[PDB]
PDB file of C-alpha atoms in Angstrom:
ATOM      1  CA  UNK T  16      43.108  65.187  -5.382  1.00 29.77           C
ATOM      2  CA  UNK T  17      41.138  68.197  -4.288  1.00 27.97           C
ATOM      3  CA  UNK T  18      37.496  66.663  -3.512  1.00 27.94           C
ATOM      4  CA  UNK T  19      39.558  63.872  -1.848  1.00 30.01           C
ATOM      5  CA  UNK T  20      41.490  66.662   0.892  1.00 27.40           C
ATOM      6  CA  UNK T  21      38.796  69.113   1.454  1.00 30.28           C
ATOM      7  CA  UNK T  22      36.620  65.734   2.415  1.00 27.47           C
ATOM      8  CA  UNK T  23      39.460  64.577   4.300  1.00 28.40           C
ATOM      9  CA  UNK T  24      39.834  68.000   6.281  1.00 29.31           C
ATOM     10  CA  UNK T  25      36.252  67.786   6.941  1.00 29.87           C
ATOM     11  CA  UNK T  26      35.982  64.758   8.426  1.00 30.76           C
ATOM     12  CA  UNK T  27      39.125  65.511  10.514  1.00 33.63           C
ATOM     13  CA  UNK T  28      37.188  68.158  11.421  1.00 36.22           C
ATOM     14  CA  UNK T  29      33.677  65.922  12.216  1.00 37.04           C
ATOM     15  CA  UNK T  30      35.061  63.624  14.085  1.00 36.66           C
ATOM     16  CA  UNK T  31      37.054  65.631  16.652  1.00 35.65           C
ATOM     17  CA  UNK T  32      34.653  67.423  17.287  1.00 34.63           C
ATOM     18  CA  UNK T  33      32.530  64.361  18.199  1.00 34.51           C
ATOM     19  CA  UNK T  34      34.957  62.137  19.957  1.00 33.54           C
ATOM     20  CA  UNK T  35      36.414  64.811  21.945  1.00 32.26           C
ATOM     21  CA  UNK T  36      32.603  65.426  22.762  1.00 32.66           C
ATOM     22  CA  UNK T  37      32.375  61.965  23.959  1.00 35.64           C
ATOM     23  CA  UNK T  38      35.952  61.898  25.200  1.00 38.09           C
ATOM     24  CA  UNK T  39      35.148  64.810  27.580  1.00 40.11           C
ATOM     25  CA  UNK T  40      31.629  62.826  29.000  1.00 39.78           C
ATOM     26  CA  UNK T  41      34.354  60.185  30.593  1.00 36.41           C
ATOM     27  CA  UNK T  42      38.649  67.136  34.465  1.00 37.50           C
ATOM     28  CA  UNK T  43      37.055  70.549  36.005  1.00 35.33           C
ATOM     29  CA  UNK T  44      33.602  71.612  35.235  1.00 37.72           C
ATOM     30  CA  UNK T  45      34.201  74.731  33.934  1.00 37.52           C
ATOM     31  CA  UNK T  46      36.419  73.102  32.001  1.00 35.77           C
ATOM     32  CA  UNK T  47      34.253  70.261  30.572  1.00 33.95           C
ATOM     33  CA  UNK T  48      32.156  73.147  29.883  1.00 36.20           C
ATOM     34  CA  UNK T  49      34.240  74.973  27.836  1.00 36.76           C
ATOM     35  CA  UNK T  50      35.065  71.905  25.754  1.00 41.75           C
ATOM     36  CA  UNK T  51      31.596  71.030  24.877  1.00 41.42           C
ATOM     37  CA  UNK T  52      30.511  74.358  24.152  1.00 41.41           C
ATOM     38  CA  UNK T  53      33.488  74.799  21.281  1.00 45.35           C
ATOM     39  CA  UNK T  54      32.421  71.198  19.892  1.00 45.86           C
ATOM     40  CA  UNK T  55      28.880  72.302  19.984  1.00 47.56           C
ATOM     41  CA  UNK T  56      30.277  75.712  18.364  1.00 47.37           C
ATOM     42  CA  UNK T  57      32.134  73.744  15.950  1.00 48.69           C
ATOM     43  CA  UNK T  58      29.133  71.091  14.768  1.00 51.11           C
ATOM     44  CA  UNK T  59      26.650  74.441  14.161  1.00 52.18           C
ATOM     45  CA  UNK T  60      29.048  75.731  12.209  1.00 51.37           C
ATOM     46  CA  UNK T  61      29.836  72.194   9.909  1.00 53.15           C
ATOM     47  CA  UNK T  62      26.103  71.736   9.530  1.00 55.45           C
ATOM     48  CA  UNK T  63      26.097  75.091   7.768  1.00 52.21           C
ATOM     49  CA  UNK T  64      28.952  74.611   6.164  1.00 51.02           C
ATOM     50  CA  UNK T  65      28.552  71.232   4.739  1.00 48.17           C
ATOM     51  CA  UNK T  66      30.296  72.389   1.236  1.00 52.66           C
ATOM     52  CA  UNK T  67      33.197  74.782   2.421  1.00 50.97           C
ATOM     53  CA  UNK T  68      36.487  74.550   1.651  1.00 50.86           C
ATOM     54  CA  UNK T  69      39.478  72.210   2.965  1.00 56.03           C
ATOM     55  CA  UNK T  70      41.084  75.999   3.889  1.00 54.00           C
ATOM     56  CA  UNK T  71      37.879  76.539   6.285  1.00 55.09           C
ATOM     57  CA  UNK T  72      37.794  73.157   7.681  1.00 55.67           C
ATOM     58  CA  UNK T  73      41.642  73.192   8.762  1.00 55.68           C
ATOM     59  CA  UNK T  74      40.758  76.606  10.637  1.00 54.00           C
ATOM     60  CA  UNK T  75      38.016  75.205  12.438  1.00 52.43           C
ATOM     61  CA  UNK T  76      40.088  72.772  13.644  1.00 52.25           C
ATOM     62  CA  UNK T  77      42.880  74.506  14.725  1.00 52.24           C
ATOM     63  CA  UNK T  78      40.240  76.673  16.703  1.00 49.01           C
ATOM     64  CA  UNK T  79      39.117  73.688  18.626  1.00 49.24           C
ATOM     65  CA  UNK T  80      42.064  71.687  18.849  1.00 53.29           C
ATOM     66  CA  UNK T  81      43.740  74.922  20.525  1.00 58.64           C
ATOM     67  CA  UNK T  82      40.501  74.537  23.707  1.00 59.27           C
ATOM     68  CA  UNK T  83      40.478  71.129  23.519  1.00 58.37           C
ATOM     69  CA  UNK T  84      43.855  69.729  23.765  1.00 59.45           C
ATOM     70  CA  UNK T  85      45.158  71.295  26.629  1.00 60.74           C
ATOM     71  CA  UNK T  86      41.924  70.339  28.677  1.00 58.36           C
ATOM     72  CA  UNK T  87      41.690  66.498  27.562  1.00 57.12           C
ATOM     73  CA  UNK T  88      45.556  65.587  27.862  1.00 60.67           C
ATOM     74  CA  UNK T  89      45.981  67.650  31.307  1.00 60.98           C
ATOM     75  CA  UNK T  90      48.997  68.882  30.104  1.00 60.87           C
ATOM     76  CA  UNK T  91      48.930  72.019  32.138  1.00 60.51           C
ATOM     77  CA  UNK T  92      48.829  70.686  35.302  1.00 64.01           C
ATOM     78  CA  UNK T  93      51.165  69.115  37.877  1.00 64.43           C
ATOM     79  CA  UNK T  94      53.974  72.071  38.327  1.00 65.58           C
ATOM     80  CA  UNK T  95      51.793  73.742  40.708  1.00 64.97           C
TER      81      UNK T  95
ATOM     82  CA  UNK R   4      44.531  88.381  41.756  1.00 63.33           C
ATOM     83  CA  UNK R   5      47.184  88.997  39.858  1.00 64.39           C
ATOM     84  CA  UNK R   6      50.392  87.562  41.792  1.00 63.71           C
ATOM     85  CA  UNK R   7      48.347  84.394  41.500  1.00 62.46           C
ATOM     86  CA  UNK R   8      47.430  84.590  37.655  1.00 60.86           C
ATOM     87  CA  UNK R   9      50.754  85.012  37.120  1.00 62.80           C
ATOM     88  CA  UNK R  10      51.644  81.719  39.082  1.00 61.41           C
ATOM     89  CA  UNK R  11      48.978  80.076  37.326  1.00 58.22           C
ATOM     90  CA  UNK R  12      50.247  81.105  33.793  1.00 56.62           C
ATOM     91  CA  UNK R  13      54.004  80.122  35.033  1.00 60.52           C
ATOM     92  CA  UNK R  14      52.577  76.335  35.692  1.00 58.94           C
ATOM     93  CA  UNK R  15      51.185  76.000  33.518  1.00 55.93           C
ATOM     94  CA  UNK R  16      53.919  76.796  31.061  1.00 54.36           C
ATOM     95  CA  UNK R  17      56.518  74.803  32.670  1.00 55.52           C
ATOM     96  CA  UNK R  18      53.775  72.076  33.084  1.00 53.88           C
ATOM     97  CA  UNK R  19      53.357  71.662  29.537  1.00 52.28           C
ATOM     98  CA  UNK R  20      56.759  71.374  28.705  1.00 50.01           C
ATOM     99  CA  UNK R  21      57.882  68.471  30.738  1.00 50.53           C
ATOM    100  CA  UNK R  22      54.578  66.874  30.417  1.00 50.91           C
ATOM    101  CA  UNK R  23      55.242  66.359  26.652  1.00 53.85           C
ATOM    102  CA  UNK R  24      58.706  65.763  26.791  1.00 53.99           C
ATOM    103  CA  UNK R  25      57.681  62.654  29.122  1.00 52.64           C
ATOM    104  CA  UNK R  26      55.152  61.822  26.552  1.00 53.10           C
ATOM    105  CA  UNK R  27      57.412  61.916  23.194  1.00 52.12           C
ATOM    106  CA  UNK R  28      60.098  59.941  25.285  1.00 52.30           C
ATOM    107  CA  UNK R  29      57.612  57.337  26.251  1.00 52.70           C
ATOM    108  CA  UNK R  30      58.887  54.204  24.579  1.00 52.19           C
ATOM    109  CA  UNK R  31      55.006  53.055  23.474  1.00 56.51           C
ATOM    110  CA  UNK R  32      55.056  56.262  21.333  1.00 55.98           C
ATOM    111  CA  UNK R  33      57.821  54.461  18.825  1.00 54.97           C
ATOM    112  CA  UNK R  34      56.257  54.273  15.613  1.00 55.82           C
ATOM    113  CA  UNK R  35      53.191  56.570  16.866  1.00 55.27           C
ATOM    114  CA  UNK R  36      55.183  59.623  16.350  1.00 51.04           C
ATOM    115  CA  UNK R  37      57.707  60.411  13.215  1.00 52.39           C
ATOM    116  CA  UNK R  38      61.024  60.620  14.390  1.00 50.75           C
ATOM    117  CA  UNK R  39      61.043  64.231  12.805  1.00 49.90           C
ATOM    118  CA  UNK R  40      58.146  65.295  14.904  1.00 51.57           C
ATOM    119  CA  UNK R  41      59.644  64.085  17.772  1.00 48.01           C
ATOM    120  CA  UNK R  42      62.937  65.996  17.564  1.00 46.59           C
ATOM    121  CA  UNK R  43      60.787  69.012  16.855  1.00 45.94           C
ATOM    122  CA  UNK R  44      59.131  68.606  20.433  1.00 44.46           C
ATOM    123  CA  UNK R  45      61.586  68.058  22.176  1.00 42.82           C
ATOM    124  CA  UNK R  46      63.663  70.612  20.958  1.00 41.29           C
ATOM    125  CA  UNK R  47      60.766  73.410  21.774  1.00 39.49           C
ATOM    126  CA  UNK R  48      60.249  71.461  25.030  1.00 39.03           C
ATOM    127  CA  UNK R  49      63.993  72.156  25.962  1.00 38.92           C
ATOM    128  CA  UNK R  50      63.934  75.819  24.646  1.00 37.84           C
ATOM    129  CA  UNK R  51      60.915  76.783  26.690  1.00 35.63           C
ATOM    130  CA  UNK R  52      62.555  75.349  30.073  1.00 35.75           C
ATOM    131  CA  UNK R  53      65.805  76.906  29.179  1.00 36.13           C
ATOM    132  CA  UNK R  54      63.785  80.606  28.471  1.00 40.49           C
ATOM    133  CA  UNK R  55      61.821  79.538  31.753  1.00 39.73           C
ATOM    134  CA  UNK R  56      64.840  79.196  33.743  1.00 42.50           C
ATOM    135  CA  UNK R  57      65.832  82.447  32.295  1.00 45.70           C
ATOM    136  CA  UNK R  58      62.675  84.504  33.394  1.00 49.47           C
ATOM    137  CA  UNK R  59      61.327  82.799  36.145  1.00 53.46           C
ATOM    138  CA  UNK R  60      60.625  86.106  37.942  1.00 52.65           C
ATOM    139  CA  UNK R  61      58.551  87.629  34.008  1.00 52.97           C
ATOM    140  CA  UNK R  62      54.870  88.665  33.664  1.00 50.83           C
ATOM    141  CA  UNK R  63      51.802  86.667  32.770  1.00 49.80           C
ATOM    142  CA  UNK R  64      51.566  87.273  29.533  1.00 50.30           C
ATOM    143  CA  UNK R  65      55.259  87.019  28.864  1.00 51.65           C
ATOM    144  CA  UNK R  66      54.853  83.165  30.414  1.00 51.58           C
ATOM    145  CA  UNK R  67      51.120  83.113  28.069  1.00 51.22           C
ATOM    146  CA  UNK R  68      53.205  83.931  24.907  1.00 55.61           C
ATOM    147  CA  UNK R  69      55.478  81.638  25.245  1.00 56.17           C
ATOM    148  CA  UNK R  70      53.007  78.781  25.985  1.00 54.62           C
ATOM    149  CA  UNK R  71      50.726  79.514  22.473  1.00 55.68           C
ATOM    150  CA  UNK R  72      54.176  79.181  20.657  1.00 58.26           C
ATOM    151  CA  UNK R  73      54.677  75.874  22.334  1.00 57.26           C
ATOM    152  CA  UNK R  74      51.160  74.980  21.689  1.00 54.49           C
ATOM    153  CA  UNK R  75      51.326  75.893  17.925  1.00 55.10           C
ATOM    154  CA  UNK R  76      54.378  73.072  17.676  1.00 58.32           C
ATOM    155  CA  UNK R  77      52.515  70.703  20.035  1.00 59.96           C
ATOM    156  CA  UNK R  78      49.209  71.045  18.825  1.00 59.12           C
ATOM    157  CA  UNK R  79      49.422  69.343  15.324  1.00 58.94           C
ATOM    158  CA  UNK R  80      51.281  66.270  17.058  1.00 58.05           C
ATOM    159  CA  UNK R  81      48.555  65.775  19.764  1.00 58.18           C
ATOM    160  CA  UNK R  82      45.457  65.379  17.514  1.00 63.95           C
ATOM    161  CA  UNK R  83      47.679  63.548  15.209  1.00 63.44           C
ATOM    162  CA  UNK R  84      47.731  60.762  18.427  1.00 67.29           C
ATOM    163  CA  UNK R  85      44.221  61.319  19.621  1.00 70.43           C
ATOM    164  CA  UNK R  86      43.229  60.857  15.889  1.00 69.89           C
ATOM    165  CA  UNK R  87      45.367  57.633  15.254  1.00 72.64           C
TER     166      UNK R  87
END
């Protein structure tokens, strides 16, 4: 039902922004940098936008999944 | 620079693709990843080398296009594993 997604996209949302946060504290330094500032981006924006909709959430993720996967999987590296 | 940019946005292209191709074959993903997903990567992962080997000598942001529409396929999957 629809409280049940938009809670689910949120805490999608929460806790990638967290764990990658974590994730990131065990790469370059620009890099980590980069990564940290999006989650930080990401958490100011969910703690003022505690009641949004499962729509919002899902783009917030996408935003941050789109810096932070690449970095955290080093998937563009080796072919150089 | 821009000879180098290029280079870098060429790596990192090709990079990507055989990186996750390796990582959807891996035989500790069964189960992990739907078999529908799978063939989905790969099949993006094989149509990015083949464009690669095609235009090895294009621009940056011919090599940066490509690599968003490879991310927009890739993207979903990936936090799917970091989230499971």
């Amino acid at each position: 039902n629809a409280a049940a997604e938009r809670v689910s996209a949120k805490n999608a949302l929460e806790s990638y922004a967290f764990n990658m946060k974590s994730a990131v504290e065990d790469i370059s330094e620009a890099d980590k940098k980069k990564v940290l500032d999006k989650c930080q981006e990401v958490i100011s924006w969910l703690d003022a936008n505690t009641l949004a909709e499962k729509d919002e959430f899902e783009h917030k993720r996408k935003e941050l999944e789109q810096v932070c996967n690449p970095i955290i999987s080093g998937l563009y590296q080796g072919a150089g």
